Design a protein around this nucleic acid. Structure first.
Lengths: 177, 156, 146, 94, 73
RNA sequence: CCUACUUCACAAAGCGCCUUCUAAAUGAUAUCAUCUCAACUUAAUACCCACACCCAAGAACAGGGUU
């Protein structure tokens, strides 16, 4: 409070940069967080005319994880206008030719279907690896929490965790395994 | 009774314990006392108040204006004690009722600025091929109130 | 267990056989799952149980050995499949796209080239119907088809 | 003067010097200006929150599009708080 | 961010909430550091908007835009 | 694309010529076995990109040359 008029308005309506981890996550929950942030729907000031969207930097987007057999079963379709130019490719082939396009198409779907969708999509920046350019790493503010609880393997178990887990049964003394 | 540490054993939501009401009502008593001292010592700046006037709730502060869509049955310039205050807060504390605050605790007082009518509004009905076209012009009466003062009493 | 050590002399030697844990909180069951109050309280996440109930090369032990009931033996079977394909078992090898909750083997699923209309849409199966009877800590139930 | 802020009525230039002179009058040490919160530093639409501190604790903070403007307007905010002519003050009693 | 103090009053008719402002600690702060198509492309990339916003409009739209709009506050 | 032939002649053509790159073991559930909606292992390049006069460029505009 007690700001001058122009800096108070500038403080209210400024847009923020949010980093979003994308390893072991589904593209849909990342798209939910991203599109909520891009429309400005995470702001109490929100209005669709005010254009109060934010910047979202989803990194590690080549290590996303479809839940289920979707990697062989979800198909992305397009049609170049020329006769016979219908291209259907699974999520695997699209993830190999371009390891950005899955989360981009998910976010493009979740965004509202108006003329602001392209500007909102141009606010968002996708990177496939841990590497982010320096001119974007100087703008981030909050690292959004990953929506999916990452599971951990046998390797990441400590000794105390498997010792605290009670082992349940009698193996027969004579069994070959 | 015992289930070992397993993914669906414990709830995903974090465990929280509510304090038993003895030290909680001690905490409530000291908080109410200390807020009462802030009220009686003038530790507030200007106050805002959610006030249920005619049929709708207004976030009313001092020195400001409200438009009301009906005759209020008052000549211009008389003051008003708006009952049904239902939230009153300051820079550091709020007081919200169940569902109202008592009339001994909040005084919100307003003046009647003006008694106009609305702009002429259009009510036009039209069903196609049925020759159905009706037009009505309405002007709803309105009064504008100047909220003057929102003061508070140290009765808690 | 026992091991077949060969070198030519070949012998079978019994080594390091475990037993029950000192106390089951609910004894007089028929299966360890029913005996440790895990009848509807595991998932594909927890590879502790799923690590117990498998061979060192990713296969399972038969029900005549582990003493499981049929229902949760099939449940542990499906959870072994779901945990192996999700990459949660990296030390149980015979000798890249990230997944989880994969019901079917990823090598033999045909893509849905023509999903149907809104009333006959071919859905994508997620999770398994054996784990349908789990404890429901969610307000809305599991969607097994996406 | 209802609705009008202080420096939309009493126009000043260089509030930082007036502020350090005022805290010299109050025998408080000269403020340290620290960049509390920032977003979009390298882009064409930045935001900086600059906080004026006095002996380990802040007297005020204020936003701006660049660090100089943010420091200047945080100085104006601290002058408002010191002079007591805040946006939160008691209204005039009529 | 979460630290406020709630208290039901004695007779239990009003809810008194107390909420001072959290001031940013000094230790949580940094010190202050001390053609026509290509034009649309450069402005679009610098402001993260599409190109379509930057092309001008005809005279009909330039005339309906209100020149002295009503100003509040 | 015009060196020849042919219609033919500052050139356009063809009948003429040139160029065109799902399967194996291993294996549990069900200790044998078993291809496994079990786990694994293995078996697009190119192309394109800085007045006026004549033109192999062209409806106009454009484009190339004007040493």
């Amino acid at each position: 409070s007690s700001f001058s008029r122009a800096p108070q308005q500038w403080a209210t309506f400024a847009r923020i940069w949010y980093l979003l981890d994308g390893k072991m996550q589904p593209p849909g929950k990342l798209a939910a967080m991203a599109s909520i942030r891009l429309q400005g729907l995470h702001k109490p000031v929100y209005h669709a005319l005010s254009d109060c969207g934010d910047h979202v930097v989803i990194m590690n987007t080549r290590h996303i994880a479809f839940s289920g057999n979707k990697w062989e079963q979800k198909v992305y379709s397009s049609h170049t206008g020329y006769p016979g130019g219908f291209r259907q490719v699974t999520a695997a082939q699209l993830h190999l030719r371009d390891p950005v396009a899955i989360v981009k198409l998910a976010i493009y779907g979740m965004l509202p279907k108006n003329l602001h969708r392209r500007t909102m999509m141009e606010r968002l920046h996708l990177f496939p690896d841990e590497y982010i350019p320096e001119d974007i790493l100087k703008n981030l503010v909050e690292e959004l929490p990953q929506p999916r609880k990452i599971p951990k393997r046998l390797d990441e178990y400590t000794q105390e965790e498997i010792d605290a887990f009670p082992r349940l049964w009698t193996p027969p003394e004579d069994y070959r395994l | 009774g015992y289930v070992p540490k397993t993914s669906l054993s414990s709830p995903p939501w974090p465990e929280v314990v509510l304090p038993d009401p003895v030290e909680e009502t001690r905490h409530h008593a000291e908080v109410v006392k200390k807020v009462n001292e802030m009220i009686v010592t003038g530790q507030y700046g200007r106050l805002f108040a959610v006030v249920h006037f005619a049929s709708r709730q207004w976030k009313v502060t001092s020195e400001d204006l409200i438009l009301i869509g009906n005759e209020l049955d008052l000549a211009c310039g008389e003051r008003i004690r708006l009952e049904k205050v239902l939230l009153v807060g300051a820079d550091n504390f709020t007081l919200l009722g169940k569902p109202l605050l008592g009339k001994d605790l909040v005084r919100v007082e307003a003046t009647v600025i003006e008694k106009t009518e609305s702009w002429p509004r259009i009510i036009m009905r039209f069903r196609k091929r049925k020759n159905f076209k009706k037009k009505r012009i309405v002007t709803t009466p309105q009064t504008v109130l100047r909220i003057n003062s929102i003061e508070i009493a140290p009765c808690l | 267990f026992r091991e077949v050590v060969e070198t030519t002399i070949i012998e079978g030697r019994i080594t390091a056989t475990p037993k029950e844990s000192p106390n089951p909180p609910n004894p007089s069951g028929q299966c360890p799952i029913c005996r440790w109050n895990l009848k509807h309280k595991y998932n594909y996440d927890d590879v502790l149980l799923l690590s117990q109930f498998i061979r060192p090369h990713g296969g399972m032990l038969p029900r005549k050995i582990t003493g499981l009931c049929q229902e949760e033996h099939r449940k542990i079977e499906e959870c072994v499949k779901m945990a192996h394909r999700a990459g949660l078992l990296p030390n149980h090898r015979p000798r890249q796209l990230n997944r989880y909750l994969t019901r079917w083997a990823p090598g033999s699923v045909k893509p849905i080239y023509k999903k149907g209309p809104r009333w006959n849409r071919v859905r994508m199966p997620v999770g398994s119907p054996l784990l349908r009877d789990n404890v429901c800590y969610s307000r809305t139930p599991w969607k097994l088809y996406h | 003067m209802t609705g009008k802020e202080l420096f939309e009525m009493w126009k000043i230039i260089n509030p930082m010097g007036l502020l350090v002179e005022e805290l010299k009058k109050r025998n408080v040490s000269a403020p340290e200006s620290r960049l509390t919160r920032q977003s979009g530093g390298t882009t064409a639409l930045p935001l900086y929150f600059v906080g004026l501190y006095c002996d380990k604790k802040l007297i005020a903070e204020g936003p701006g599009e660049t660090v100089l403007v943010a420091e200047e307007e945080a100085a104006r905010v601290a002058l408002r708080k010191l002079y007591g002519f805040t946006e939160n003050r008691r209204p005039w009693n009529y | 961010n979460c630290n406020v103090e709630l208290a039901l009053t004695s007779d239990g008719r009003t809810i008194v909430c107390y909420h001072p402002s959290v001031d940013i600690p000094y230790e949580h702060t940094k010190p202050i550091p001390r053609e026509e198509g290509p034009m649309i492309e450069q402005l679009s990339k610098m402001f993260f908007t599409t190109k379509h916003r930057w092309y001008p409009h005809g005279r009909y739209h330039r005339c309906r835009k209100n020149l002295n709009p009503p100003k509040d506050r």
